[PDB]
DNA sequence: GAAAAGAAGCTTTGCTTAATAATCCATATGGTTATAATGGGAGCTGTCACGGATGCAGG
């Protein structure tokens, strides 16, 4: 969707803004991937699904980071190896909120 | 005889997970300590009845 395009525009705007460099930005399963450079704060990528949900996924994230993203109301799915899903709705205010909580981790 | 409806048969896809890079950490191994530092310790103490093998000795 073009809303996913514009939310990609503000996403790269606020990740490029806040000094969080990217490994690669990928359209994969027709979904966006704002992948972090290193596994910083136990986080892998800042992805966008086309199903109205931008998602933050990681590997062995600390609990207090997860609490900081449930401050802005995000779902989580831990795995058996430390893989953690973080669901939020894809919107510009959620772009600003997720990248401003990620910008203070 | 039409028309909803449900399966056959394709696809994706979010999730998992097994293979593999990375790293770190137990582990071994050896070295190296330059004053001088000179014979242990529990041994049980209240069996016991037989018995055969030493063991010693004088004729």
UniProtKB/Swiss-Prot annotation:
<protein>
    <recommendedName>
        <fullName>Middle transcription regulatory protein motA</fullName>
    </recommendedName>
</protein>
<comment type="function">
    <text>Required for the transcriptional activation of middle promoters. Middle promoters are characterized by the presence of the conserved sequence [AT]3TGCTTNA (MotA box). MotA binds directly to MotA boxes.</text>
</comment>
